Design a protein around this ligand. Structure first.
Ligand SMILES: OC[C@H]1O[C@@H](O[C@H]2[C@H](O)[C@@H](O)[C@@H](O)O[C@@H]2CO)[C@H](O)[C@@H](O)[C@H]1O
Ligand SMILES: OC[C@H]1O[C@@H](O[C@H]2[C@H](O)[C@@H](O)[C@@H](O)O[C@@H]2CO)[C@H](O)[C@@H](O)[C@H]1O
Ligand SMILES: OC[C@H]1O[C@@H](O[C@H]2[C@H](O)[C@@H](O)[C@@H](O)O[C@@H]2CO)[C@H](O)[C@@H](O)[C@H]1O
Ligand SMILES: OC[C@H]1O[C@@H](O[C@H]2[C@H](O)[C@@H](O)[C@@H](O)O[C@@H]2CO)[C@H](O)[C@@H](O)[C@H]1O
Ligand SMILES: [Ca+2]
Ligand SMILES: [Ca+2]
Ligand SMILES: [Ca+2]
Ligand SMILES: [Ca+2]
Ligand SMILES: [Mn+2]
Ligand SMILES: [Mn+2]
Ligand SMILES: [Mn+2]
Ligand SMILES: [Mn+2]
Lengths: 238, 236, 239, 237
């Protein structure tokens, strides 16, 4: 009646055997997780890459009415040669363990037109279902976010992300901070993990570059820490 | 060289030998840290309470060029009988280890209006607009002054549980504070560049401070429901 | 330059996605990891079971000269209908990520009689030709023949608490067993060079076998498990 | 209903505001916790030193039926100029929060035969056979007495680093202590059934105590090199 898992990497090892790389994703010799293709130092169009931690995570348990609380921190960089033409974005996500890459472009490698996936997206291009401004969105089994906050993307600057899920209140909270100019953004939503996802999931990142040559950008993850605890609800708190 | 300290309480024992209680602060029989006085269910005016963890925390070290990264989470409630008349607020803070209560009211038990500056870094949840404050209720980052270096407007929800997370990243000197109300999934965040080495001594105590208003009609509670803290002092 | 991984289960979930079950191993409805076969309440002969955590662990890195330090705790029970006829044993181990079951019987599902990379701490209940006469706790480096052991007073059906630690800076592997029922304990340590014994990445877990005769039978059940490893640069300023 | 505390130091800062130093204990300029006096490079007789973590630890609560489980690890050295004449030893201990140094010499700064009312639970690394001791140097588990409830013979290695791990499993009341010399891969262990609720008050301080001999020729250092402690007080399962 307690299961706890954590991991933390201050950079990635170039051939990381505890990370499942999908699509174009790779780790560079200097330990950056380059989700979308970069060639000759330029980001390339029509790229999709994802990365998952090797172990599935026990996020809820039907036989005991436990639901996990979790938290994750990571830093990422999106750098674009043209700040007026950026696409498509990067996300943190949870999905069934055998999850594969879904539709490219605006679907971020996570969703499709035709899917259980919960995601926090950092969305750089306004699709038909998006607000006009770049945004941080919380997504539950749809590319259309259930709640978002407008996001002032800073080209090429390190973004520090912290995401937490409080099982007792069903509250998912996502924040981004730029240390370069000490500016931050936050959004929360009420999210029921038990109805959106299966009992076991893999967790990780997904990103796509645009579907035209002139809307390109990198989606690089520099470090990552994750913890989840599946335990019985407390009867005495408040 | 690494020095790591962590503590977590899902609620407080009523006689907590690892918390230094100052002023009016107490723990209720149900395990809530009641910073400011409550009589017959009503919050009382002219109250000041603080609470510090017993062990000092090593936040920087001159000889080895180290500065700590830290993070803290807690939940709190501020409950007012009259939503239009609320004072003064609650704060999480770091101060020298022998820190004692400082001025009441708008000074939140943390600062004062004398010539002598005080070493204290705080994140304040401010319910009352003093001369030095913005008009709205706000979350502020305060570095050795009751006047915040940076703040965000705050939609205070009367009697609702607020979840706070505060982190400090030594490598970029970035302090970030967030508040979320799970009851309506609404959140607020503010960050600031803060140099701990210039603002504080090498060792500090950490905890909470709160004050109620200096008029009988401007009263509210300042209760902390749980608390987790971790700090790591390690080489750059 | 730091990679840290930790997991802890107070009992196992009956269909555990984050455990790779091999051979006969299964988790019971009450959350026990039953490595070797039990039919109608009795342990069965010629059984081999193993179980590994799903994530590979980064135990050394050629590029930076880091070597991990790790610790693991677990509780286990070995229960036998006949105390004078026990075989073969249970082990905690580290092996390459694609590790598969190896020889049964005295080989504990880990080694064979053929070059195998596996480091193990074994709780050995039957004296093979390479064993001391008494039951024992052994530290094993790429061989079924232990590099060091301590004689072990096995208590039939009682919970045994194990603690194993590896201190990279001294290459010291330490293994202990305590029975809380009688407050009795056993310990053994060895100097083990993980870099030369194993690949950079490994999987970790348990292996056990029952006897190769109908009458030498006993359970090998694990009740909980915690593990933590840290791969970081060596400390330059400690003692 | 959970209270968790953890701290770790890879070496001690020279003016450690989170450690209460008592008696002769000091931290050297290189970060070693030197519990007993050293003068001109030589350990001095009639010395007693102790050190406690600044925050009290909540080890049981009557109202909720909780008892803590804890674990601690540390390395230490005991170095003697004359291997045939060693005294008195070093210990890890738990005591009431306002604990003060008790008798010197064989009482390890922890106990006193005059007063059996002392509350203190300890794991001792005992280098000198007193009247209440076995003959050999030994690792002992002591509960409100200098006379160990359980011990194991200990092959002390002069001036070598010893790695200690101690754990307390609340649900079975099992206290387990182990010592390992990395230098020769040699280890010792002992366990005991210990009821913390009847031995100690609800809140304690934790740390170390040591003493050097009560004669000029029985002298040895008692230095702690690091430390890591965790305790969790939570509902019984
Ligand atoms: O330009 C970036 C966007 O491309 C969109 O796809 C467009 C594409 O850009 C255009 O050249 C033509 O092929 O029509 C496509 C419609 O599918 C993506 O939908 C959008 O996400 C951006 O990546
Ligand atoms: O009403 C809440 C505020 O009280 C202020 O104190 C005032 C007080 O309101 C007024 O009655 C006067 O007589 O005394 C004080 C003016 O010096 C506090 O200064 C302010 O922080 C609020 O708490
Ligand atoms: O009886 C338990 C031991 O069996 C040994 O295998 C024996 C087997 O028992 C015997 O019937 C005959 O087949 O010879 C085999 C090999 O000598 C295992 O080697 C030993 O590990 C025990 O399990
Ligand atoms: O020599 C070390 C031990 O001294 C013991 O005390 C002795 C003392 O050495 C001696 O002078 C004698 O006359 O009486 C004392 C009691 O036997 C300590 O008791 C012992 O703990 C060591 O320190
Ligand atoms: Ca989009
Ligand atoms: Ca104010
Ligand atoms: Ca054998
Ligand atoms: Ca003695
Ligand atoms: Mn979007
Ligand atoms: Mn203010
Ligand atoms: Mn053997
Ligand atoms: Mn003794």
């Amino acid at each position: 009646m307690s299961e706890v898992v954590s991991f933390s990497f201050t950079k990635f090892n170039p051939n990381p055997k505890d990370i499942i790389l999908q699509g174009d994703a790779l780790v560079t010799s200097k330990g950056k997780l380059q989700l979308t293709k970069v060639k000759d130092g330029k980001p390339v169009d029509h790229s999709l890459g994802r990365a998952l931690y090797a172990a599935p995570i026990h996020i809820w348990d039907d036989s005991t009415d436990r639901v996990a609380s979790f938290a994750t921190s990571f830093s990422f960089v999106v750098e674009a040669p043209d700040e007026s033409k950026t696409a498509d974005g990067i996300a943190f996500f949870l999905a069934p363990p055998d999850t594969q890459p879904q539709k490219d472009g605006g679907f971020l490698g996570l969703f499709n037109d035709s899917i259980q996936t919960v995601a926090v997206e950092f969305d750089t291009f306004s699709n038909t279902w998006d607000p006009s401004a770049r945004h941080i969105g919380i997504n539950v089994n749809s590319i259309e976010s259930m709640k978002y906050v407008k996001w002032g993307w800073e080209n090429g600057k390190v973004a520090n992300v912290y995401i937490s899920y409080e099982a007792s209140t069903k509250t998912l909270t996502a924040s981004l901070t730029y240390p370069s100019n000490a500016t931050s953004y936050i959004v929360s939503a009420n999210v029921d993990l038990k109805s959106a996802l299966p009992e076991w999931v893999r967790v990780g990142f997904s990103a796509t570059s645009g579907l035209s040559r002139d809307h390109v950008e990198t989606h690089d993850v520099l470090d990552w820490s994750f913890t989840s605890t599946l335990q019985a609800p407390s009867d005495d708190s408040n």
